[PDB]
Ligand binder design. Sequence first.
Ligand code: ADP
Lengths: 335, 457, 258, 254, 170, 159
Amino acid sequence: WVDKYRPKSLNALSHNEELTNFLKSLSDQPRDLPHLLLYGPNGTGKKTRCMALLESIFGPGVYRLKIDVRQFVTASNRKLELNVVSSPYHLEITPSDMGNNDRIVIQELLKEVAHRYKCVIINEANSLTKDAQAALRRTMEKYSKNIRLIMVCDSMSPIIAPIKSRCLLIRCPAPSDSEISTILSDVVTNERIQLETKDILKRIAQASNGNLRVSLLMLESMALNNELALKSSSPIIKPDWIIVIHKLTRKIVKERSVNSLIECRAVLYDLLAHCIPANIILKELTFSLLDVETLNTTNKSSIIEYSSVFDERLSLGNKAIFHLEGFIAKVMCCL
Amino acid sequence: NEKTNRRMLGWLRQWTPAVFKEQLPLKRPPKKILLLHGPPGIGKTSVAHVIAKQSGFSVSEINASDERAGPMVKEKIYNLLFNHTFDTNPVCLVADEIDGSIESGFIRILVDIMQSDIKATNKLLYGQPSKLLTRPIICICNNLYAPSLEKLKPFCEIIAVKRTTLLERLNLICHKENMNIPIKAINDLIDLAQGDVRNCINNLQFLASNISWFKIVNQLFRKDPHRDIKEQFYELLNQVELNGNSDRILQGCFNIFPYVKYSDNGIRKPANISDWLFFHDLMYQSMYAHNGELLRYSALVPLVFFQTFGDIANKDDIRMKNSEYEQRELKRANSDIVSLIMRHISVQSPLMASFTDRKSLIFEILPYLDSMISSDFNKIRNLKLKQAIMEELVQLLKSFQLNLIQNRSEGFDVRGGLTIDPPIDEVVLLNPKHINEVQHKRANNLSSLLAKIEENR
Amino acid sequence: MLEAKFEEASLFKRIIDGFKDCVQLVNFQCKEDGIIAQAVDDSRVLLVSLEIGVEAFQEYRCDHPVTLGMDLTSLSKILRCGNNTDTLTLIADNTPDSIILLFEDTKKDRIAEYSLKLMDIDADFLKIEELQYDSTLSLPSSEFSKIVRDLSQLSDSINIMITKETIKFVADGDIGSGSVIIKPFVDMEHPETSIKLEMDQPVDLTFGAKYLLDIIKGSSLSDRVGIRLSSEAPALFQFDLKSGFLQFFLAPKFNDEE
Amino acid sequence: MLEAKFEEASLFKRIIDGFKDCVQLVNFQCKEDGIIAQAVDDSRVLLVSLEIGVEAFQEYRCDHPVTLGMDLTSLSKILRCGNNTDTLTLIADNTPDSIILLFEDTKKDRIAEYSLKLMDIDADFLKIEELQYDSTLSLPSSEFSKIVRDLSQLSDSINIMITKETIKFVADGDIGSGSVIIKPFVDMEHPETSIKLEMDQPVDLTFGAKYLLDIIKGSSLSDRVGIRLSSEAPALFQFDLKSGFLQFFLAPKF
Amino acid sequence: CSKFRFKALDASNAIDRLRFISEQENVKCDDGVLERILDISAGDLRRGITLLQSASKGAQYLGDGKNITSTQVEELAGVVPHDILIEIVEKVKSGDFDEIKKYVNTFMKSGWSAASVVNQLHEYYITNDNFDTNFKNQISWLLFTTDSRLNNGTNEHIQLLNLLVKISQL
Amino acid sequence: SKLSDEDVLKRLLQIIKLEDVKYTNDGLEAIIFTAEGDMRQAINNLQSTVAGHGLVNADNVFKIVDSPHPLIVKKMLLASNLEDSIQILRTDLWKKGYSSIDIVTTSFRVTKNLAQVKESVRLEMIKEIGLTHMRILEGVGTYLQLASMLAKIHKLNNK
Ligand SMILES: Nc1ncnc2c1ncn2[C@@H]1O[C@H](COP(=O)(O)OP(=O)(O)O)[C@@H](O)[C@H]1O
């Protein structure tokens, strides 16, 4: 399992040695530490490295944490309920658990909270609205001797420039397939899995695209289908939504009409209704449509242009299906 | 509807021996309630009133949608059915909008009155040595298959009113006011008033002294071949502006356009309209940020549908619904389930919560967790390996705080299905075919997992 | 089991008035030497702690301690039936799902009985009281209430400063600043109006006015209030009862901490 | 400088209660013969004017007049610390940025001191009082309050009409009409209950009930109220103090 | 209000402040480090001071007693190395849609900010005196459109792939 | 309904006869033109011109009152060449103190109510006037945005 085998310190990290050394350098003197922003691909291990860095800044009790609840009152009598992950040395907030009320929670909670300082971990800073980021802009600078922010995100694209300047930027590159294979080897020798040939582990990496969280989960999922004994040709366990997207692309390249557009809209609705973001849906749909060998360069260029345009539309809109169906119709018109 | 009006009169005349003691155990009609159904505005209420008055009854009307106190109303209905009115004429009860009664109080009272009268009649027929219903009841609905009416239907004589009666009524008013109105101008007034009887009478009185957003959506897909396209466009613009609800009209257009017939070359028309729809979504987001000067441009986006998809082929009205409110409520419910799972992980898994984003939880973690729980343990011959997997699954159920609840809502002592709380199934299972397969497999696994959780407890 | 009869329902009603508003959940525990109760607000800056000895009751029987948690709001909602002069008996079995409040008039006449649903709260009573505080002072509680009510209008923070023979309350905000200075004094004409002060070390702490306002409610339970301050711990404001006391421990503001 | 000590903080608290609500800004000025204060509401239909002579104080010292403006709301917020029986001293230097209110109990015990921030207001005291008014009348202020409280319920306008030996208050609105008629009379059993009236000319003026309601507050300062009416100017309602008075000038309707 | 426009703090008008900060903290660096730091800052003294503090911490942890190098600074500043950018130029110049897409998918595995990659590509294409002016107008407009799209919170992978594909067709 | 030219002219003639005012035909024509079926506005402009200059002449009416804002905007949008529309926008609207918001909003109204051109080109012009608007409301309201809007409208009209 991902959680049973996870590093708890900086000396327990097993990939990106230069990043581990940079973290040790940054944690050598912990009091004169500026705000940090960990950015990189999703599933690389930045949330583990931030906790490992906190374990170097403070005692080992940083992992002994508790979940509490805090209530807030907006301009109306609608009560905002937010759970907080707290520790005797730091606290974690995730403003991605609500709508446009991120600014209120951010400002009030950070003002109440504001070695000698208490660390703050803002999870998924990409969901932070521009108004919440503007509110945090001055809170980052006014209280710099009591509150230090460690913002974990997957892409600095939606982060405003003032926030980017107000904190150090640390990139976490996805681990190489060799390091993923070495980690899976230790996992299967500790979990007592039977490998007929080691190369299958490499293939797992080649199916994860640098994601360790996905790699270990897929390894464990396929270890339950092969009954704790992986063979030389064990099938690759793909998530359900990926299969739905692949079938959607097959339907797209097979039939291009309005009658098929209706069932495409139905599939998009069924995907969106089951807690699947539309940006990831669009990304996977476009990337798997480019993989269609039936199309040519002229089709793929138009497809990527339309996907960029409708990604901008979706980032500027709120009704996600209104942009997804438009992108699908434009792709149908292109092919 | 003369045939229907004569049937109603025939049914009310069957009450005459019981009420008036006139010769055509009480010789009452077998069905004591008359149920009128049909479209709005066709005169259901007017026909009930005229036929009851023509039969010598005093008419008492009750709107069943407004009377939110059946148990209280009860006193009104009981007084109107069983007490003598000061009027010489027997009362006929007319209940309008009986399908609008969200609280079954009114209908339960009518059913209780009918059951009490059946018990009282059987005592008069078979009783060796109780208020009998002596007054007719007319009920009016728009929808016959409304769930509330299922209990009332067996006691009712059902009469369908189909889509002239307004013209006849207005002519009778004109003749009594000594107004010589040509029948053409009365038809034009009926068409102007859209079958509103109150508006018709007021417009007639004014002459004497001298668009549902759905209808707009269906009009936006229609082109009249006999009128200038520009005149049709300005008429539609004025109708969209007067309605003030451009958003609902556009959502209507968005639901209708895939089902509409439109000369298709490559389905590009839909690609051009996705850009407008995106323009509308940006405009609608900006309305909450900026003073509503931008509201004037909101009426233009629905008119792009008339330009692009308007065709002479679209003669039939397409009915519509609100998939978005249902999808928004479902998205809210699923987000609340996910937020509760994320809180449970934060309380138990001290480190897991730091690596779990809401999106990664929905798309990666929950589908694998459900596939692990739904796996067919019956294929595993090795008992030791089955026990080890079940111990790991019990540890996973504990890390995610997933409780196995015996839903004993079966009600007939056979198989109370085991359900996971929170229901991960509603978030993960998008495919209706996979739901049925997974439910049958899970029922046997969850009983084995519950037995193991109880053993561990 | 729980079996505690108050002579006058009024005493219990005033005690609960003290927990009222500032806390939501209260954890009671009855035992051989009486009843104790603790409640902590959500921000964890205020602890309300009660102790009622056996002698405060007209009848008390306990052969087996019982711990029970409940919603304060639910309790007060029910705590206005005492007629003040009514007799009140708190009753509960050894493994309760509810707490029974029984109000009776002298004569058999009228009997109001309630069965309040309990909440499960992890038993974890705090014992944060100190051996010695930097400074200790007592003064009439009505005087303390006025002092708090004055300053509250000026700021969300009220500072208490103690130096030899001097106690000074200060508030400073938008409209200006205010201060109330009091001096120790023994009034023999009636010592319940005296102002005592024992200072081992000068102190200077700031508290959130909203909390001091919650605390002043104790005036209704005692003529005097004891205030114990330290730079090492939450301040203690105490209101004595006949056999018992109601205590409020309030954490000083760090710079911004209630 | 400003240095005025009131025997009982209560007097000042009741005086300020009179400006309360109906005005936001008040301009005070202390000088050799006492303290005056003026406040005008936003619509400019009501002027509240105060005068407290030197003798109303237990101690008053002024060698240099000081004018100071302040927010009424801020002042009242602070004006509930007087214990009524507390002693109150108003203090300010010759070029103040604040006004100090000092409440002290007889014994050295408790000293509540406030430092209220001042507002800069262009000094422009009005002198709109008339030599002669068409009619003048006085009656118990509690009676005037009742009269106003009665009629207020009926309309937003209350008319006062005066003819020889007759004073009539009238309100007429949606639910109907009402009137209160009073007649002049000398009660020797206690003349503080008498109703005097001197009419040089019959008068008939209408006032906004919301304003008369603000004015009745003066009852707490005096047993009687004097009302002076004219068709040429704002009406004057006056509440006498020991050495001083609180006056309300109200402009009639159209 | 009187409008006061604050100018960007490039190397010229901020080298004195950066050198003062370095001397006050005994930041032993090479000749062209500070001027390079502001060059990465693009008119932002706060980001430059943060980068200088990070470089000083990384040089004090090592304890080798050497001077900070421009390469060590641009490594922690999020700047793509020159060789990786030259590989992108080769893939854009010579290569089809499939090879470019595969290389972009591989490059997005290593965490780099798309804004920095776009800025470096713009600098390389506009500065290199080996492309036609007609190509330069198109590359400038494409980079402008890509930056404007990236400034709205879009997906970096899709935008970068679209930009590279559009500039490869030139 | 709106008041035709004859009715407002008759009412103004009656008022002039009742007030003994010096007037001329072109002045009354300009008054009625600037009134746009608004009798109250017509009488107000007449009284203002009388009290400001004494003689009701077209020159005085035009120097005291503004030529219907929408008509200059219509003439600007209906221009055939880009330079003519640019010069009109510069001299008539921008050099006289008309705010960009008023120009774009008046522009939207003129287009919506236009009948000279077809429906599709009108919708495209409204789209361009509105995308610009979205920039005008964000505080980017300048002359360059209106110039680009006019250029895009002409490009749409450029087949
Ligand atoms: N140093 C490391 N060595 C081995 N595995 C690691 C290391 N750091 C993280 N992992 C594991 O790799 C995966 C990374 O995914 P995840 O933890 O979700 O990433 P993040 O920390 O960025 O949220 C997890 O299974 C995590 O436990």
